[PDB]
Amino acid sequence: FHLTTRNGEPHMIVSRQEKGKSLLFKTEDGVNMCTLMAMDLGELCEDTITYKCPFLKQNEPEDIDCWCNSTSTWVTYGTCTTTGEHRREKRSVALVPHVGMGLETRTETWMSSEGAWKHAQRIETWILRHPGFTIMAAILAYTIGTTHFQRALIFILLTAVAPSMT
């Protein structure tokens, strides 16, 4: 409850030595009878919370932490626990990355089943997602193709080459 002045106003620093008890002083203004009704007042810390106890003459206090029946004043205290810590822990912030690529390398090789079938799976996925381009390629094959074998070969070539450009 060491008292100083800042911005022309009194400024008492309270600690656990006087906790949950009526603060009392004698100042130029008069008999200062403050009630520090706050919550997180523990032993003094470095998380220095500060407060204006507002001047209240006779009215019904409410929705305040600390007040004084003499004059407005500043009060301060800490918030860390008894053992010593910053403050109460929480878990928050939303975040997640992409997921990687490694020990696979990005070129058609290795004869593997997955690598071998990836190209065909991507072709058929493109065809399913691109029916219009498939129909257009079929129509071009029909027009240009004089024989059914050439028709099918050109259709397959177009359907396989169009995605590879992307």
């Binding site: 919370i49 500060t50 407060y51 204006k52 990355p97």
Partner: protein, 495 residues
């Protein structure tokens, strides 16, 4: 030879007169270089590292705070200004709350409150960027001397380590007992670097895409600053309890190390404890083995006792690795080394370590060699005391043919555009020759008779004439191409 157990063991079965072999190299993959009557080499990269990385932007992880204050004025007085809020060293906010008639200023209404505190934080990320200049590669060169501590040994003092970088072009290196090799290398093929960033936490590191840093909502520090006082997006860590008349207590988010570890998982973890193993990009390294001497081709012939200690430790390629001790005297001497068929009619093997030699008595030597496919006999020594070891390799002929040609095809694929010497006029013929070698020379030398080159080039010109004078043009194009490849590649193989 160092590289045993590494799955990706690439081969170079042959050399030409120019000897300007451009080796491919990649993380976790060794390379073997052959050369007719020249020392046989093993190449690896043991460690990729980008020394002296640059710092992009630091991120905060654990927030201390102090000097938190809550000032306010009655409604119709304007939210108060503070000496606290005008400095970037703090973090702060203005808010609106319904002060009631009993609440100090007896005029109930919604008014302003300024709340804020100091914000200096303890643990922080280290964000870092790597440029193509800073890429330092560490290349290990080894001879096939067959020293004992070679199988499953990497850093053993038997070969040479060189500190290659694109900033450097030429530097000679010395292989003890086998002369000189010139590192005229060319580390050209960095995969990509604009969208990759390195992160460090005390004693661990990670690799992550740049956008991830650019979008992650946590406190910032640009790389230039050093006071740790100016911060951007500093409000995200502080989360404010709902305003309470004049109370407005500020709290932050606590230990984020756990959140980082559980969220960042799935990205490329890098074991910075042993330095930053950057598993990215291939090495395209030109080597000329013209001035690399072999010590022992002139030695006498071994004539003493012969004995085997350990049998084959079967490799991924089914390559015989015989760790064998020769109690016989006369060392140094050349070793009898034949790989013969069941009936023992003709030899068809391919020994790796040319001139297998024992440097000193009472010493094991690890001879590397690749036998044919199927069953066969390994003949070591000379009668009396002739030593025979039966062994079978499970691979199929045409199989291993197609996979080895495919390894060569991949090697030329990465060693492709801008790589193979197309600019050098006159040497363009040699470049195409070496390309046809590195693709089809397995077929040439393992399928087409082995070969005694004169008679096969005679057969090749016969095939070319028949293809040219054929009944169908498709068959002509198919066959004369093979014939000309045979002829020219044979001329190359002779060299």
């Amino acid at each position: 030879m160092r590289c045993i157990g590494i799955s990706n063991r690439d081969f170079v079965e042959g050399v030409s007169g120019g000897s300007w072999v451009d080796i491919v190299l990649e993380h976790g993959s060794c390379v073997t270089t052959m050369a007719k009557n020249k020392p046989t080499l093993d190449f690896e990269l043991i460690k990729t590292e980008a020394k002296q990385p640059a710092t992009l932007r630091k991120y905060c992880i654990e927030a201390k705070l102090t000097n938190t204050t809550t000032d306010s004025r009655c409604p119709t007085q304007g939210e108060p200004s503070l000496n606290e809020e005008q400095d970037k060293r703090f973090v702060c906010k203005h808010s609106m709350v319904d002060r009631g008639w009993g609440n100090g200023c007896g005029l109930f209404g919604k008014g302003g409150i300024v709340t804020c505190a100091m914000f200096t934080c303890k643990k922080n990320m280290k964000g870092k960027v790597v440029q193509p200049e800073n890429l330092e590669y560490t290349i290990v060169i080894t001879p096939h001397s067959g020293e004992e501590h070679a199988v499953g040994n990497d850093t053993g003092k038997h070969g040479k380590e060189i500190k290659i970088t694109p900033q450097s072009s030429i530097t000679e290196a010395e292989l003890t007992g086998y002369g000189t090799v010139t590192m005229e290398c060319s580390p050209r093929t960095g995969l990509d670097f604009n969208e990759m960033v390195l992160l460090q936490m005390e004693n661990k590191a990670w690799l992550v895409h740049r956008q991830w840093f650019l979008d992650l909502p946590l406190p910032w520090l640009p790389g230039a600053d050093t006071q740790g006082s100016n911060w951007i997006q500093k409000e995200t860590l502080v989360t404010f309890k709902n305003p309470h008349a004049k109370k407005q207590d500020v709290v932050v988010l606590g230990s984020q190390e756990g959140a980082m570890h559980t969220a960042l998982t799935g990205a490329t973890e890098i074991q910075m404890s042993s330095g930053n193993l950057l598993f990215t990009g291939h090495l395209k390294c030109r080597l000329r083995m013209d001035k690399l001497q072999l010590k022992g081709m002139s030695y006498s012939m071994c004539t003493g006792k012969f004995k085997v200690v350990k049998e084959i430790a079967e490799t991924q390629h089914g390559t015989i690795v015989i760790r064998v001790q020769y109690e016989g005297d006369g060392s140094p001497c050349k070793i009898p080394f034949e790989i013969m068929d069941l009936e023992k009619r003709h030899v068809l093997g391919r020994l790796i370590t040319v001139n297998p030699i024992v440097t000193e008595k009472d010493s094991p030597v690890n001879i590397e060699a690749e036998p044919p496919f199927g069953d066969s006999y390994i003949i070591i020594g000379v009668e009396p005391g002739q030593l025979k070891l039966n062994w079978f390799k499970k691979g199929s002929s045409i199989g291993q043919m197609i996979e080895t040609t495919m390894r060569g095809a991949k090697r030329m694929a990465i060693l492709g555009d801008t790589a193979w010497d197309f600019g050098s006029l006159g040497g363009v013929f040699t470049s195409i020759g070496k390309a046809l070698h590195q693709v089809f020379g397995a077929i040439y030398g393992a399928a087409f008779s082995g070969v005694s080159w004169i008679m096969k080039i005679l057969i090749g010109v016969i095939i070319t004439w028949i293809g040219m004078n054929s009944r169908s043009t498709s068959l002509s194009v198919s066959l004369v191409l093979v014939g000309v490849v045979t002829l020219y590649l044979g001329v190359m193989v002779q060299a």
